[PDB]
Design a protein around this ligand. Structure first.
Ligand SMILES: O=C(O)CCn1c(=O)oc2ccccc21
Ligand SMILES: O=C(O)CCn1c(=O)oc2ccccc21
Ligand SMILES: O=C(O)CCn1c(=O)oc2ccccc21
Ligand SMILES: [Cl-]
Lengths: 274, 275
């Protein structure tokens, strides 16, 4: 497909940029940096970088402009999964058949590596060589990532989740959890790409935000559906869940009304998800 | 010396600014925000904020200019302590007699509250209302904090410590300079940036200052514990002498600074005069 090729391009590109970030500045830090590299360079699909690049293109920006954005959102993502894997959280020994970072190294080193990955996400955005936007735009990219990654966004979502165990969530509560835990960062990926284009305007930003809201949820619905083929199918029944995923794809496509052909990657992604 | 009063003024001010950051934006996030507040609003002495304010004043800036800097360095510091307390690290039930965050709440919540505190540190610096410097200066503050807080600074120092075992003075100093020095130095740097009057020579001198006091503090601390350390490496009396040498280097780095740098001078003396 066109989307398969777009994904593969985004993945090669961001991977090359990320791989360069993990050189220990001195010998004593080698194992720390190897854990950082292990936590990031793990064959992930890089959906968040794809979204940054595609949002950048949708507004007419050359995609290399979003390199730093793409790296930052992937760094946030990766750190979040390392902390999530720990015994006090999800306690996961394996991710796609490979040991998780605390299992491959040790729990302290995993905690620290991921802590350093979060810092690096911000470092890369603030670095006007790696992220060479107008300074006001660099700051807005930082602001948006920090809000989305923190306790009002992704980390907050993780807290809502742990605070809902043993409660039977209704759909509205489930969606509140998803919008925080995964939606904030998806939205920030699109927002930061769009900002990197050097052509953002408030109307186009608001429309891309509607797009992102839609596809973020659509990812979760469809994930639950593929698991079958407190979940969307369990709440709704399998068939109504499938209908809901199509509704989300339609909201996503509608948000892109008026965009030029250079938004086709975002349209194609919305279809691919469902 | 008025250093105690300077410290108390810096503490009240930064505490007021920090306390305002822990309002949950909706109900479902209340307990997370409470754990964040619990992890920061613990009566700490706020040395890093003190440094940001004093560096700002040392360069003729009004101190409220450094409010965001002060908050950001304290947030990084507070998150680092919460993760350090965790069972996989130092495994402490107590911090100054009070239950650690993982005990008062739970381990996941401690991990997450601290993760959120790190994001907030960057949020506060990038927020041009809370940190109303020129844009280029906001970015340099962000750059410096990020580098100091991450795997090449504070987190790296934590890894070096974890990774160490049979260690010589140079290697001990490498560990300290990362684990504690980087953030101490960034506190001074950010405050100086916030003055609006930074320049390379002054920045460099303040960096020498920060290097010196960060180390002096660790030397004096080992000396007081008596009661792989500075006294064991050097002998108790040469360690005491080395603490004075570090204070002197700190004070020499501030040669030529005006009287408004007096808080930094008094702080350097205080570090080696305690007990
Ligand atoms: O599994 C693969 O390697 C290709 C699958 N794949 C694709 O074709 O487009 C995608 C967009 C986002 C994530 C995965 C995608
Ligand atoms: O802890 C007190 O209230 C008095 C001790 N104290 C002081 O007098 O100045 C200080 C600077 C930093 C940390 C502690 C300091
Ligand atoms: O972490 C703290 O707040 C207490 C330790 N501490 C202090 O009280 O004065 C210091 C000066 C330099 C480095 C650490 C110092
Ligand atoms: Cl389709």
């Amino acid at each position: 497909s066109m989307i398969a090729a777009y994904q593969a391009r985004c993945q090669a590109r961001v991977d090359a940029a990320l791989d360069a970030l993990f050189v220990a500045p001195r010998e004593e830090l080698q194992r720390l940096y190897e854990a950082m590299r292990y936590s990031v360079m793990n064959g992930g699909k890089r959906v968040r970088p794809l979204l940054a690049y595609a949002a950048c293109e949708a507004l007419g920006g050359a995609p290399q402009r979003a390199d730093a954005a793409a790296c930052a959102v992937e760094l946030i993502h990766a750190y979040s999964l390392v902390h999530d894997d720990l015994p006090a959280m999800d306690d996961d020994d394996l991710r796609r058949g490979q040991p998780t970072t605390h299992r491959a190294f040790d729990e302290a080193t995993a905690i620290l590596a991921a802590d350093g990955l979060q810092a690096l996400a911000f470092e890369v955005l603030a670095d006007t060589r790696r992220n060479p936007q107008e300074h006001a735009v660099c700051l807005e990219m930082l602001t948006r990532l920090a809000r989305a990654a923190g306790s009002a966004g992704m980390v907050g979502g993780q807290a809502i989740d742990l605070g809902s165990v043993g409660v039977a969530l209704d759909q509205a509560a489930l969606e509140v959890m998803h919008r925080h835990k995964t939606g904030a960062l998806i939205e920030a990926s699109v927002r930061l790409g769009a900002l990197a284009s050097g052509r953002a305007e408030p109307a186009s930003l608001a429309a891309l935000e509607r797009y992102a809201e839609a596809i973020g949820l659509a990812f979760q619905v469809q994930d639950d559906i593929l698991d079958v083929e407190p979940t969307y199918p369990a709440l709704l029944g399998l068939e109504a869940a499938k209908g809901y995923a199509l509704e989300l794809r339609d909201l996503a496509l509608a948000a892109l009304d008026g965009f030029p052909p250079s938004a086709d990657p975002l349209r194609q992604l919305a279809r691919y998800i469902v």
